[PDB]
Amino acid sequence: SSGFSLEDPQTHSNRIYRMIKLGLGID
Amino acid sequence: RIMKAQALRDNSTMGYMMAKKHLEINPDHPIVETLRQKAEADKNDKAVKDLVVLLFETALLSSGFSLEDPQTHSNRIYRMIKLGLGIDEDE
């Protein structure tokens, strides 16, 4: 939100998917 | 990303050199398999509409596009934290 890019956008997305698997009841 | 950031280039004429985004999904991966089960019951269900924007935003972000509206994604993950902390209804 501050204009800074991530060091590894993939691991943010993996952590968001670790949350979305709760969101979809997968695992 | 680089052309947008130039100090002295007129980007208004980008229309003929900007590419168009084609979205590709992993047929094997659990989330997409679950999403065909979710979409199966109701094609018009907003809950599957809401994923296909959140997943798109999450996929953009990984691919190097900027959010033209970064606060929406932020407020989504803050509403996600209100789940993760059990305070989503403020009670």
Place this chain on the structure above:
Amino acid sequence: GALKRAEELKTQANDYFKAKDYENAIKFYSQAIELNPSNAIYYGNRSLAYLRTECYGYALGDATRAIELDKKYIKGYYRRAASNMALGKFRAALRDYETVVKVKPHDKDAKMKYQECNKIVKQKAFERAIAGDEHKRSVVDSLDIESMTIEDEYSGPKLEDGKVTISFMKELMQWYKDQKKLHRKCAYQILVQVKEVLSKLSTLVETTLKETEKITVCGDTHGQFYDLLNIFELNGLPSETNPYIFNGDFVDRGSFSVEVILTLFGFKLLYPDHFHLLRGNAETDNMNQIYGFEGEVKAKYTAQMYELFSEVFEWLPLAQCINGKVLIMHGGLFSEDGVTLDDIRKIERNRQPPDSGPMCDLLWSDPQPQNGRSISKRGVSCQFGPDVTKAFLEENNLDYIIRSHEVKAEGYEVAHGGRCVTVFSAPNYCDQMGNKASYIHLQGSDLRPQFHQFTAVPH
């Protein structure tokens, strides 16, 4: 004691209930409670039988009272949670299930159901965390801009908050003679209110026109201030007193073209019931690029004004019927003879198809005296004629059609015996094109086309 007779009646009630004879059982259940407040296990069974017979309230109350007086009644909490689920209430069923599960952890049937319902609640919780309104926000900022009052009022206009007086609509027109403009906030103030009204108004318009009232029609009137003055010579004031249909290209091919819609939108707010303003093709988005209006507005006001006018050009009425006897239409109905405004209405007024496609096929399907349907060189690739138009009049129960798009070397058209009617209302298009214009006088009781001629325009 009478309770024992009700208990014997409950033994046969369980046989009867399992044979769907519920009314006998429920009479015996009433007789049992009429004496006894305390037969908890058999209350929970009337709670179940009630759930099966959708008597949610009785069962819910029976379980609540029992659990209040008996905090250990675990089967009652299970019945209560099952009834809550059936009613559609998850969080109450969770509180009951958690309470069953903590009071008697040893029953796995309560435990597995609790966790299934928790998993179901995770979906609704995630839905409340992910969702938002399904539109781009855009023009709602026009409310914010006005509510911020960057400046409030100006040397010309005196505008009200909404429903601007007829005297101020008159004033606005008479310094369009002076060639002044509205202040940006007050131009937004009318335009967002107009948008809201147009967004509420019928999804496509059908009207029974009344008997004594006299038609004023404009076909195309590519916006010019002398044309506004000249229609106020041609007729009296629209004034909730005469039906006034603006069935035209208005917003394009004339210097005063945002000004025409700025006053006409005002009149539509003040005269809603029989003032009807229909899409030209030339009111559509791309028309403003090709004839520069997009940039002409952008000089006159900052670009967001033009975006609002382009949005209001999608909120503007597409086609409509007068008395079920004439179609008022820029062009003619799309594709085959079966299409009505009741077919078209199902598509909402927030859209445009391709330039040859169904709404544009309305807006621009050309005539022919050639009786069949046909396709045309102009660019829509469509033109229809007297056999097909008579088939539409029968299919749709009308008697005639009025059209407005077609520039003339002189005046109006009467073609194929007058079943189809043309009116054209732009005497000068620009200095490339000056020619005679037509107006029509028609009356809402008796219907045939009758014609008025209009000679010359200054600048």
